[PDB]
Design a protein around this ligand. Structure first.
Ligand code: SF4
Ligand code: SF4
Ligand code: SF4
Ligand code: SF4
Ligand code: FES
Ligand SMILES: [Zn+2]
Lengths: 114, 28, 162, 108, 100, 68, 682, 95, 144
């Protein structure tokens, strides 16, 4: 369903800007640009997904090595303007925060199979 | 009317995503 | 350099058996049906040089390489940033076609294609790569040669000292 | 000031005085911090979260870091050198940002 | 259960650091000259190990950074070579050593 | 041969209108409107040469201009 | 098999190779590609990685191709199953202790280790033990270290010793805990430091400025040249969208073997800062936004007042051939001959090409037996050129310097520090003179400092006296070379961008000064009441003193011609589009020519190139260096009275480059260069 | 005589020639024999000798205000080269 | 089709492949089925832009639309075709899209204008350009 960037339990984002999800995206819906953070971490300065270009294949969730990007269980995300459907890093992180427990339970169940 | 992109007119600090800093002429 | 000895054999054989009929330069471009201002664009026919990060010779024009390595590329045009999302916007229809799909085995093939469509072209030959080691380190033995500091002076010998 | 300052790294996972790898994003807008470029609010940043977490003492000269507690539900396994590490200057997991330090090298 | 040296890089210590000065004593320097005479003049770097052993014996059993730099200056070689040789071999102790 | 192909394609263009494949608005947009626009156009004869005008207009002359 | 050539069999196919090749060289000649990690063409053979193992029927066990000499009638098998198994085993040993850092490694899309793992390795592992761990250390502002990812090849150490010559890196340790780096905390001092990053196969050494910013597949590469100095190093500029992300060298054995200096590699940072985007016209409120027409109108009103030599042109370090020929034609049409170059060697004669170019090609300096460096610090002027002089020093060439004592990587004989020593050497009183005379291939290199000297004529006459006495110029070998520190100097001399007879004879206070990218002008050049037009791409000392500022494209944004110190004409490409309301410089000058009432004939880039071909035929031969007829002696016979007129100065032959990292406007804008300068000055 | 007057007449003088060619042999003789004398008479005048292998021999003089007159010097003896330069000087006098 | 031993009663499809490196760019491919032999055969005719291929519709009625599609996508003319017309592309389309020299996005774009109450075609502008990711390895050998 709706995409969501995830955080570690400490509150640090899981994303390490490998940029594999952008390379595997069949529709080219993900644009990523990154930098070195002041502490020294490899972190993204931009992570936006076009939900009017997404095909919800789930390939990006497959390619991510740290489980940073997941397709959440939410299918109620219609909008009244197309601009609200161009997600960005802050919106994706907020969506990950809102659905954290459900996503974690689904991932714990799914880990057994794969 | 809660979420809009950062380049939107509604955004408090609207962003022009220019990747080059421009020289500011000296005063007077 | 020996032979691929695979489907490329039949590929080359289909090439040498068959041939194309000669037409005046630029006539096919009218048959193509694309905007005629496309052929006003200038063409550069070049082979990419090797990336400095990697030491593989596949991308270079080397006897190891069996893939087409000569590209037709068009000149770069204006690019801007989307005011809303900062995406890179363009108006160039021919931005990625030449890099992505226009691959040719030989420079004359790309020149023939350009002359057939009517594109003006400039062919740039790659800088020659010769795998010649320098005389100082021509071989592994040269690393431990007397060249480093000269023949050992024997004036330190006890017989020579006394 | 930030307009003419050299981009520098605080040094948690880097050194105190190094250059910071920087792209040109935000250069026109006037933002020169990593978090400013992507967060427009005044809330707590994830870097503020990771700084709040304290370094953890371990035994040995190498610690295996899987990010999370379960190996297959976190970062790839990583082996971090604990030599020359203390509470003030801990080693860092690049994937997670967790900080570690050990006293074993001092023969303890 | 690691031995004296756990570091293959220089660990700054109040005893061992850049300001520390080591030089051969005059008698030890005469021994240095006799040691060097055994090897050809142009290939003078051949004496690196005997000189490092002599400096270790003089300095109480520790090969410090000043010792390595002094040996490198005497042999007219880049200091990294003396660092590499002092790190390769076992007898060279680069940490403080006891009486025995 | 190229002439033959071009003639066949032009015959196709005629047949589209003749067989009602294309519509009235297509004919308005692609033929009648531009021709009428050209007649209604008033322009000042530019004293600047062709180079100066394109130089003032854009950096890359090869890129098209819309709504000129 | 003519003489030196032998025959070898590789996989049952006959290959004819010289006797001095190895097994790997013949395998490359055969079209077979052997897996390598530690072997490098321009570095000493190591043989440590053991990934090149092939089979020789004569030998019982597999041999390393890189270090095995090939023999007549040798049969080489690179596809035997034993070799496949050995390749897989070596790959396993390479990967057992490698960190699982592929997502966070900046070598992710460009790693030799990954690619050879896929091609020549197994798909699965059997290692369950603890991996080795290393603690990284600072090597400077430009190099990032992840020594855990380090496979113990010796490419960085061999480069630092043989090529760079700072000899700072080594393998300290024994066995598995052996580590690479300075044992002490030291920062890599060579200006060729960036090359270790490219030489590193497995991302252990990485570029700190280009850290976590992009991946390889995202970048579009355009092959262009470096204007940082007059070497004209061939580079590949990688761009994402409208941003240049990184600059890396290209192979050109003629000029830059495969090495790039740090300034050229890391000056792209200053291409995003202090940029000029719009025309600016001065008012009471200062420089303000203006359209192209308004700026041209102001320039027209200014030029109307000035007449003849009152119009003055100063070209910059980064001006290209087309903009300079445009400005030359426009100002000659207006009636001015006051065309000078900012360097300070304005009056240097452009009459004979042999006088101001390196007549010996850069490649041919390899064959030099004795080299004399006059008033030049080749390290600062061109680090890669100093690398080649180091290569010839390694062969056994004897090098003498007649300038100030400088820290060249190699050892040299200090002949003297002042002009009088060169005078004595030219007269024939010197042991080094008897070495220059004896040598079969003598090379004399004169630096740009001698050209920017108030007594350049007599110093050049003394150098020519030495040339004639020692016979460095002979049939089949011209040993006279002049090294330049700027890209635009040789082109400006070639086109004829030199003050005219009237300008030198009767100096006229300039009323309008045109700056073609000149931010290094001497302050006396502008009379301080002149109307200054600055055309350029960064805001610097030039733009601050401008009544009208005309934005122009940079070397990354324009297709322009530059001439090397050897005179080889090379051309740039448009890597990224032009920013804002800026234009190509020759188009700006031609538009201004139309505005002012003297329209220039050319209206297209090929027409400009044809005009360049007319003014100098070699400009038509892009990519080829043209030989120069040795006319230097006739020139000095011509200028007899003038060289007598030239006096003596109380200055010693020395470089004019105070700080190497900042020498032009782009470098001064760069933040990375500022950090490098601060690190050196501490 | 007229060799003194090149400076007054010409703003610059260009001698294009081929490095090794039969057509440019006369130009090579002209440049390697009279260039020193012409420079001695006109020290401050820029006489630019530019050469390429495929270059076609020519003698070009630039007068005031950018007026340029090109004279082909191909397959002409060194004396003819001198005559052609004299004609260029006379043409400059006409202006 | 009609040989007793070889009875390829069916034409599965007709296709063309553009090879710009070759002088004879287009390779027209015919795929057939013999139900009796339970076998598939592939027939290739190598042509260029100017030459034409005789229509085989009289042998197999299914060919008509397949040859019309080949004409539309690649520009290969088929002689004696009953009515050779474009099938897939928009009315008024003159370019042949599957040619390797045709841009992926094309040359024109379609929008409705309020001023002229018509849907109109305009030159292409892209808000976000197509990003070509070059994944090729130097060490690869399978590339021919
Ligand atoms: S689900 Fe598929 S299309 Fe959507 S963002 Fe992920 S990879 Fe791209
Ligand atoms: S979301 Fe996952 S795959 Fe995408 S950049 Fe971040 S870590 Fe890489
Ligand atoms: S060096 Fe190569 S294999 Fe090792 S972590 Fe980096 S990308 Fe992965
Ligand atoms: S840092 Fe790179 S070049 Fe140096 S030894 Fe390690 S892998 Fe080799
Ligand atoms: S390449 Fe020969 S052993 Fe490494
Ligand atoms: Zn971890």
């Amino acid at each position: 369903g709706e995409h969501a960037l995830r955080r570690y339990p400490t509150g640090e984002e899981r994303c390490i800007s490998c940029k594999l999800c952008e390379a595997i995206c069949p529709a080219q819906a993900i644009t990523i640009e990154a930098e070195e953070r002041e502490d020294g971490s490899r972190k993204t300065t931009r992570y936006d997904i076009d939900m009017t270009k997404c095909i919800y294949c789930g390939f990006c969730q497959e390619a991510c090595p740290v489980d940073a990007i997941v397709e959440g269980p939410n299918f109620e995300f219609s909008t009244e303007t197309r601009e609200e459907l161009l997600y960005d890093k802050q919106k994706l992180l907020e969506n990950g925060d809102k659905w954290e427990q459900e996503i974690a339970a689904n991932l714990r169940t799914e880990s057994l199979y794969r | 009317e809660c979420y809009n992109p950062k380049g939107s007119w509604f955004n408090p600090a609207k962003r022009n995503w220019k990747k080059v800093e421009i020289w500011q002429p000296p005063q007077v | 350099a020996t032979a691929p000895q695979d489907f490329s054999l039949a590929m080359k054989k289909a090439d040498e058996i068959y041939s194309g009929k000669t037409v005046k330069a630029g006539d096919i471009g009218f048959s193509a049906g694309v905007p005629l201002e496309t052929y006003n664009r200038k063409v550069r026919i070049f082979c990419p040089a090797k990336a400095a990060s990697q030491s593989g010779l596949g991308r270079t024009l080397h006897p190891s390489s069996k893939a087409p390595q000569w590209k037709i590329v068009f000149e770069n045009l204006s690019k801007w940033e989307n005011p809303l999302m900062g995406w890179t916007s363009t108006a160039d229809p021919l931005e990625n076609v030449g890099r992505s799909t226009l691959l040719f085995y030989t420079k004359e093939e790309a020149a023939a294609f350009c002359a057939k469509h009517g594109w003006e072209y400039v062919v740039d030959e790659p800088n020659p790569r010769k795998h010649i080691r320098q005389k100082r380190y021509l071989g592994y033995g040269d690393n431990y040669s007397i060249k480093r500091k000269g023949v050992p002076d024997l004036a330190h010998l006890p017989s020579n000292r006394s | 000031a930030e307009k003419n300052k050299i981009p520098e790294t605080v040094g948690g996972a880097a050194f105190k005085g190094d250059l910071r790898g920087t792209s040109a994003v935000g250069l026109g807008d006037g933002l020169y911090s990593h978090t400013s470029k992507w967060m427009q609010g005044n809330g707590k940043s994830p870097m503020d979260y990771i700084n709040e977490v304290e370094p953890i003492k371990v035994k040995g000269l190498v610690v295996a870091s899987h990010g999370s507690d379960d190996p297959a539900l976190g970062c790839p396994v990583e082996y971090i050198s604990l030599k020359g590490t203390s509470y003030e200057n801990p080693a860092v997991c690049k994937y997670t940002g967790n900080r570690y330090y050990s006293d074993c090298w001092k023969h303890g | 259960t690691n031995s004296t040296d756990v570091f293959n890089v220089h660990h700054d210590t109040p005893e061992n650091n850049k300001d520390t000065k080591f030089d051969f004593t005059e008698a030890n320097y005469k021994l240095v000259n006799k040691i060097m005479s055994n090897y050809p003049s142009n290939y003078k770097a051949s004496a690196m190990i005997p000189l490092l052993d002599l400096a270790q014996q003089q300095n109480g059993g520790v090969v410090s950074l000043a010792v390595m730099n002094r040996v490198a200056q005497i042999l007219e070689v880049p200091p990294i070579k003396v660092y590499e040789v002092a790190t390769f071999f076992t007898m060279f102790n680069r940490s403080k050593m006891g009486k025995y | 041969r190229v002439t033959d192909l071009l003639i066949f394609k032009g015959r196709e263009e005629l047949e589209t209108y003749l067989f009602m494949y294309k519509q009235r608005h297509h004919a308005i947009t692609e033929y009648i409107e531009p021709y009428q626009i050209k007649k209604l156009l008033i322009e000042r004869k530019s004293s600047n040469s062709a180079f100066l005008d394109s130089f003032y207009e854009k950096a890359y002359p090869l890129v098209h201009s819309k709504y000129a | 098999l003519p003489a030196d050539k032998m025959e070898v069999f590789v996989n049952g196919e006959a290959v004819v190779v010289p006797k001095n090749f190895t097994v790997l060289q013949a395998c490359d000649a055969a079209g077979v590609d052997v897996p390598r990690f530690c072997y490098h063409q321009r570095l000493s053979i190591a043989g440590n990685c053991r990934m090149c193992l092939v089979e020789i029927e004569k030998a019982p066990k597999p041999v390393a191709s890189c270090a095995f000499p090939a023999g007549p009638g040798m049969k080489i098998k690179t596809d035997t199953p034993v070799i496949k198994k050995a390749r897989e085993g070596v790959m396993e040993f390479l990967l057992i202790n490698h960190p699982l850092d592929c997502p966070i490694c900046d070598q992710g899309g460009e790693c030799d280790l990954q690619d050879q793992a896929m091609i020549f390795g197994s798909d699965r592992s059997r290692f369950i033990e603890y991996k080795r761990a290393v603690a990284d250390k600072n090597l400077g502002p430009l190099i990032k270290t992840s020594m855990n990812r380090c496979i113990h090849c010796t490419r960085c150490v061999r480069f630092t010793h043989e090529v760079a010559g700072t000899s700072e890196l080594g393998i300290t340790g024994r066995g598995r805990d052996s580590e690479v780096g300075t044992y002490i905390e030291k920062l890599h001092s060579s200006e060729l430091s960036g090359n270790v990053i490219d030489l590193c196969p497995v991302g252990a050494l990485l570029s700190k400025p280009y850290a976590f910013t992009a991946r390889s597949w995202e970048l579009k590469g355009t092959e262009t040249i470096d204007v940082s100095d007059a070497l004209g190093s061939n580079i590949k500029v990688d761009c994402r969208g409208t941003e240049v992300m990184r600059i890396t060298p290209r192979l050109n054995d003629a000029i830059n073997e495969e090495w790039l200096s740090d300034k050229g590699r890391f000056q792209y940072d200053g291409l995003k800062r202090q940029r000029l985007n719009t025309p600016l016209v001065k008012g009471a409120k200062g420089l303000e936004n203006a359209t192209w027409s308004a700026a041209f109108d102001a320039i027209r009103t200014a030029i109307a007042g000035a007449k003849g030599n009152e119009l003055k042109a100063i070209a910059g370090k980064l001006a290209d051939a087309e903009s300079m020929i445009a400005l030359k034609d426009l100002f000659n049409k207006l009636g001015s001959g006051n065309l000078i170059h900012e360097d300070g060697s304005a009056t240097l004669s452009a009459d004979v090409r042999s006088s101001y170019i390196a007549n010996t090609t850069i490649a041919s300096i390899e064959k030099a037996d004795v080299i004399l460096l006059v008033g030049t610090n080749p390290r600062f002027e061109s680090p890669v050129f100093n690398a080649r002089l180091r290569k010839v020093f390694l062969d056994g060439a004897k090098v003498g310097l007649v300038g100030e004592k400088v820290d060249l990587t190699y050892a040299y004989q200090h002949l003297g520090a002042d002009v009088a020593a060169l005078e004595s050497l030219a007269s024939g009183k010197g042991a080094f003179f008897e070495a220059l005379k004896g040598a079969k291939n003598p090379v004399v290199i004169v630096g740009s400092s001698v050209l920017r000297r108030d007594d350049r004529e007599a110093v050049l006459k003394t150098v020519n006296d030495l040339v004639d006495a020692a016979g460095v110029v002979k049939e089949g070998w011209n040993g006279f070379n002049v090294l330049h520190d700027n890209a635009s100097r040789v082109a400006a001399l070639d086109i004829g961008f030199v003050p005219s007879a009237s300008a030198r004879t009767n100096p006229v206070p300039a009323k309008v000064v045109y700056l073609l990218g000149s931010d290094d002008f001497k302050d006396e050049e502008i009379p301080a009441d002149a109307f200054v037009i600055y055309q350029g791409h960064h805001g610097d000392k030039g733009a601050a003193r401008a009544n009208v500022v005309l934005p122009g494209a940079a070397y990354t944004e324009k297709a322009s011609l530059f001439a090397n110190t050897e005179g080889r004409v090379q051309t740039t490409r448009t890597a990224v589009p032009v920013l804002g309301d800026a234009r190509e410089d020759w188009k700006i000058i031609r538009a201004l020519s139309e505005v002012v009432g003297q329209q220039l004939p050319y209206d297209s880039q090929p027409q400009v190139r044809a005009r360049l071909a007319e003014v100098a035929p070699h400009f038509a031969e892009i990519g080829k260096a043209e030989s120069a007829l040795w006319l230097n002696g006739q020139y000095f016979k011509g200028v007899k009275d003038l060289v007598a007129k030239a006096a003596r100065s109380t200055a010693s032959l020395a470089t004019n480059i105070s700080n190497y990292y900042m020498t032009d406007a782009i470098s001064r804008a760069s933040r990375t260069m500022a950090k490098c300068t601060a690190v050196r000055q501490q | 005589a007229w060799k003194t007057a090149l400076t007054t007449t010409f703003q610059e003088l260009r001698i294009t020639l081929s490095q090794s060619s039969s057509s440019s042999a006369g130009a090579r003789e002209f440049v390697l024999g009279q260039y020193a004398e012409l420079k001695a008479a006109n020290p401050l005048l820029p006489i630019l000798v530019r050469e390429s292998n495929a270059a076609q021999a020519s003698l070009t003089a630039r007068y005031d205000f950018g007026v340029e007159k090109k004279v082909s010097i191909e397959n002409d003896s060194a004396s003819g080269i001198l005559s052609k330069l004299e004609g260029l000087v006379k043409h400059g006098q006409s202006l | 089709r009609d040989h007793v031993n070889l009875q390829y009663k069916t034409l599965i499809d007709i296709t063309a492949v553009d090879y710009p490196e070759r002088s004879a760019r287009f390779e027209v491919v015919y795929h057939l089925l013999s139900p009796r032999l339970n076998n598939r055969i592939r027939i290739k005719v190598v042509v260029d832009e100017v030459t034409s291929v005789p229509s085989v519709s009289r042998i197999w009625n299914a060919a008509n639309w397949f040859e019309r599609e080949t004409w539309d996508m690649f520009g290969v003319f088929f002689s004696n075709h009953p009515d050779l017309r474009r099938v897939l592309t928009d009315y008024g389309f003159t370019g042949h899209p599957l040619r390797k020299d045709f841009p992926l996005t094309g040359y024109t774009e379609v929008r409705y204008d309020y001023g002229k109450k018509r849907v109109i075609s305009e030159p292409l502008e892209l808000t976000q350009e197509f990003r070509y990711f070059d994944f090729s390895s130097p060490w690869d050998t399978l590339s021919r």
